[PDB]
Every structure is written in structure tokens, then in C-alpha cells.
From a paper:
[name] ([name], [name], [name]) is an enzyme found in lysosomes and in the extracellular space where it catalyses the conversion of sphingomyelin, a major component of membranes, into ceramide and phosphocholine.
As observed with other saposins, ASMasesap adopts either a closed or open conformation depending on environmental conditions. By contrast, the open form of ASMasesap assumes a V-shaped conformation with its hydrophobic core exposed and its position shifted on ASMasecat such that one face of helix α3 forms an extensive 1,318 Å2, hydrophobic interface with ASMasecat. The interface presumably stabilizes the open conformation of ASMasesap, allowing it to dock onto membrane surfaces, and possibly deliver lipids to the active site. The location on open ASMasesap responsible for membrane lipid docking under physiological conditions likely includes its hydrophobic surface, which in the crystal is buried by a symmetry-related saposin domain reminiscent of the ‘handshake' clasp observed in saposin B dimers. In addition, the top edge of helix α2, which is lined with a ridge of positively charged residues, is appropriate for interaction with anionic intra-lysosomal vesicles. In the presence of anionic membranes, open ASMasesap becomes prevalent, docks onto the membrane surface and concomitantly forms an interface with the catalytic domain activating it for sphingomyelin hydrolysis.
Author numbering: 84 to 610
Write the structure that this text describes.
Amino acid sequence: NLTCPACKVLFTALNHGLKKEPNVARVGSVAIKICKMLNIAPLDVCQSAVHLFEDDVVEVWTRSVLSPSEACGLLLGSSCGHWDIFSTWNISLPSVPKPPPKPPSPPAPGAPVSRVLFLTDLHWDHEYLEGTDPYCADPLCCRRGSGWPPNSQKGAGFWGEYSKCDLPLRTLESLLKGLGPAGPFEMVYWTGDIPAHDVWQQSRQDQLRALTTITDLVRKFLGPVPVYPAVGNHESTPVNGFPPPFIKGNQSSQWLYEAMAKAWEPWLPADALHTLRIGGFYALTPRPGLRLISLNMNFCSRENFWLLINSTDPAGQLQWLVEELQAAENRGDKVHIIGHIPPGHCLKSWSWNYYKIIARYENTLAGQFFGHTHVDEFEIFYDEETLSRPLAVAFLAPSATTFINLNPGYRVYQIDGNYPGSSHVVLDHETYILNLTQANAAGGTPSWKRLYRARETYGLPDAMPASWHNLVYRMRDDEQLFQTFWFLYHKGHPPSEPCGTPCRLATLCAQLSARADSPALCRHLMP
Ligand SMILES: *[C@@H]1O[C@H](CO)[C@@H](O[C@@H]2O[C@H](CO)[C@@H](O[C@@H]3O[C@H](CO)[C@@H](O)[C@H](O)[C@@H]3O)[C@H](O)[C@H]2NC(C)=O)[C@H](O)[C@H]1NC(C)=O
Ligand SMILES: *[C@@H]1O[C@H](CO[C@@H]2O[C@@H](C)[C@@H](O)[C@@H](O)[C@@H]2O)[C@@H](O[C@@H]2O[C@H](CO)[C@@H](O)[C@H](O)[C@H]2NC(C)=O)[C@H](O)[C@H]1NC(C)=O
Ligand SMILES: CCCCCCCCCCCCCCCCCCP(=O)(O)O
Ligand SMILES: [Cl-]
Ligand SMILES: [Cl-]
Ligand SMILES: [Zn+2]
Ligand SMILES: [Zn+2]
């Protein structure tokens, strides 16, 4: 009734009053008070952190949740406004009828094989310090500010520590030198997450220092080998905050996207840098017959608060994705996709609109590779209508960082080699680790070793989805087999707590949940 305008007026005033930071500072003070009461982190971390966020978090709030149109529609109904914050949305596919489903034929004898190294979640802590308390109250330890191990306890290890601690640069430098046996590689995929988890005290200069430093360190050791990286979530500041392109000004993400451009011009062509400076994604031809696609999965992130304003296909990334897939289908080209956050962890509507595009172009896809989870995992795609036929699989390589309680490690994919008629699909992959227990030991030397090989330990005929599909339900029945998977799940450093059946099924359910908030995919695991 007459309350409808009063709503629109009040929200307008508060939004204006939030232009003035002193009130925002008060509003910020409250968020801190909550931070301590909820024990997200020690108070030292709260104050620093909140001060970073309040400015931008309040901006989106004024532009979205507390916008008069949106808010009034919620309290009073459609009569007075419209509430659409995380409303659902759809993507339109082309008018081309999908060709009959078709799987790749296995490679012929003597066919060349390509090696592709996969690096993700390096997470460099430039403040990392040996001897400091690994058990500190702060969300990140083993550094300056962590203090020192109380009561004659062992401090942070020299190369790293099995705890909430990221890596020292020397351990990262060590990784690059020990790729001899893992190589030679034809190209590399790098799905971001370079900074550490010390978000409560990260200036843009701190962020870009890691970008440049780490980028130069890679290009140096790799040399002529092209590296194709993707955007991670820890790479901007504030973390997870990735304003879509329609946002402009100093609060835009231009500083980051343009900084990446300079650092990566040697690796990428012109048309890819064009789109990268805009939305943090790109595509290009790495070799004849293949088309690589790097996605800015921060436009699917629940954490991206900028999506409150408009969560509907930010940057038109999905529509841009379809353009490329259809083009490759016309050419007959295959496709690999890399991104940081895997689709199973995206926003619901985003994830579903993605699932369907996979289903449509199952024949075009030759690979999907992701990270962010820091553990060794995968996710299988099925036909949309029935979720019965597996049609694609994504690989969730484990992180390089120890964060948390992990052995460092990276991933290497053996794929169909560079030759005409290549399917460009994965044939096998290998995982290498660093056994810190032995490296940080007295008189110990860093030694990278192959933890295992895929088809070897799991005895698979191929790396196609069906093989993995069978693999999942197999482990549901056999206990000892999962205990092995559990071991490799943690890069050779599993937890102490045994994984009970509920832990097991939870883990296994995730392997099928390539789509968010859909219990039907875990129907077969428990009746
Ligand atoms: C990384 O290196 C560490 C080195 O400590 C490995 O942990 C060690 O693994 C050995 C055998 O795998 C185990 O030690 C056992 O000790 C018993 C008696 O305590 C002895 O009878 C056995 O012959 C064996 O030596 C134990 O799990 C562990 N040792 C210690 C001192 O912690 C770890 O397995 C390595 N990780 C990888 C992925 O290779
Ligand atoms: C919310 O956003 C979607 C698309 O994201 C952005 O929205 C536009 C405002 C613009 O910034 C685009 O460049 C971005 O992609 C909007 O839906 C799209 O709207 C455009 C028209 O601008 C249209 O061409 C597309 O077909 C639409 N696609 C979809 C999936 O909706 C939507 O209108 C935005 N809502 C508001 C209130 O701005
Ligand atoms: C009545 C509706 C119930 C739910 C409302 C919840 C919103 C709370 C957010 C308040 C943030 C504090 C900012 C105060 C800014 C004051 C500006 C006054 P001025 O423009 O005259 O200077
Ligand atoms: Cl140190
Ligand atoms: Cl079928
Ligand atoms: Zn990470
Ligand atoms: Zn991440």
C-alpha cells in the first residue's frame, strides 16, 4: 500500500549516507564485532581484513541488495519492485542440430603422445619463515606474525609444513628444476591462485609482486614451451572480488587484467590478450586441430560479491563460450577447457547452464582441467535428460601448496600427440610430489618423485568417462581400494581420522556432482 514509496525513500537515503565513509566505518566496525564473536580469525586479522572489504562490499550492496527496486520488491511483493538477486537465468544454444553422439577411437599404434604439465594453487607466502609457530591462531602460520612454537615445539619446516601454511619461494623454485623426468612437455596449463592466504594484509602491490615474480620464474625455466594460464580466485584483492566488465573506474579489475597482459604477452597471441584485458578469459589454437579455452570462473563464484548486482552470465562469458564451441564443431576442431574453480562448485544457475553446454558439445570436448580444491579429484558429466550416460570428465589436479596438511605436488597429462587425425584427448596422467617428511628431516634433501600413475594404480583401460564411471561405484564396494584413493587424494599425506562410509560416500558423491545442488546425481550411491 502506501508503504511502497517509504521503502524507496529510506533505502535511497542510506545509500547516500554510505557514500560517507565515517558511517561505513561504523558499519565496518559492526562486521568486525561479528568477526570476533564468530571466531573467523583472531581480532588482529579481523580489523585489517574488514577495512579492506567494507568499501567495496558496501558499494555492491547499494547497487543491488539495498537498491530500492530490488529490496522493496522483496518485502512488499511484486506490486512494489522486483527482487532478483540470485534469480535463475538461461542460456540460448545455437540452431544447429547436435550431431549423433560419437566417442573418440583409441589412438593407433606408434601414434605420438604429448605431455602437458598442470600447475595450480601454488600459493606463495613471501613472509613464510622457518621456526615460526605452525600452530598459530591466525588463518595462516609459519611466517612473520605467527610467533614461535610455544614450549620447545618444532617450528615451521625448512621447505614447508603440514599445516595451514603456504609455500616458501625456494620450495616453488625447487619444483621447476626437478621436471626433467616428468618432461619433455609441449605446453602447460596453469589455473591460478598464486598469492597466499594472508588476505587481511594484501595490497595491490603485494598482489602484483607475486604475479610478476612468479611469472618470470616460470618463463625462465620453461623457455620455448608455451604456458597457458587461467585466472584464480586469490589473485585479486579483495579476494574473490571480480567486478564484471560493466564496472568501471578504479574499483574495476582493470589493474589486474592489464598487469597480467604484460606478464603474459610472450605466451599469448593478440586476439587472446584482447579478451583477457576485458574479462579474464580467452581462447586460442595451441596446435592444429585443437582449440584451448581458459575461463574466468570468478564470474561463477559464490564468493564473488559483485554478482549480487547482476548474477546473470557476467561478461557474457557463457554466450562467448558457445560461439567458440560451435565454431570448432564447424571446423571439426577439438577443445580443452581450463579454469580455476570447477563447475561443480559454481553458482547453481551458472553450473546448470554449463552442464548443458557440455552435453551439447560432448563430441567437441577433448579435455577439462581445473584446481582450487588442492586435492586429487575428478568430476564426471552425464547426459542432461537422464544423467545415465557419462559423456565427459574434468580433472581436478592437486595443488602445489601444502595448504593444508598436504604434500606438495603437480600433475602431468599424457594426451593424444600432435598429429593430424588426433583426438587431442587425455590418454593418462602422472602425479609428482615432494615428501616433506624426508626433505625437512635432519640431513634431508628435496627429492621429487612420481607418487603414482593413473591407469597403473587404478588399472583403467583408458581415460574416457566410462572407465572413471565404473571406477566410482567400484570403490563404493571395495574398502581397501578407496583407502588407496584416499591416500592419493592427499598427495601421499592423508589425514589421521579414518574415512568412514559417510566420509567415503560424501567423497564419492562429489566425484559425480559435476553440477551444483543436484542430489539426483548421488542417487545410486545410497538408497
Ligand atoms: C615419506 O617419507 C616418510 C619417511 O618417514 C614415510 O613415512 C614412513 O614410512 C615408513 C614406511 O613406509 C614407516 O616406517 C615404518 O616404521 C616401522 C616401525 O615404526 C618399521 O617396522 C617399518 O619397516 C617402517 O620403517 C612409517 O609410515 C613412516 N616412518 C616414520 C618414522 O614416520 C612416508 O611413507 C613417505 N611418503 C611417501 C608418499 O613415500
Ligand atoms: C544482467 O546481465 C545480463 C548479461 O550480463 C551483462 O548484462 C548487460 C547489462 C551487459 O552489461 C552485458 O554486456 C552483460 O553480459 C543481461 O542479459 C543480457 O542482456 C543483453 C543486453 O545487454 C542481451 O544481449 C543478452 O542476450 C542477455 N543475456 C542474458 C542471458 O540475459 C541482463 O539484462 C542484465 N540485467 C540488468 C538488469 O541489467
Ligand atoms: C526499515 C527496513 C528494515 C531493514 C533495513 C536494513 C538495512 C540496514 C543497513 C544500515 C547501514 C547503516 C548506514 C546508515 C546510513 C544513514 C544515512 C542517513 P543520511 O543519508 O540522511 O545521512
Ligand atoms: Cl624461512
Ligand atoms: Cl545414449
Ligand atoms: Zn588454491
Ligand atoms: Zn582457488
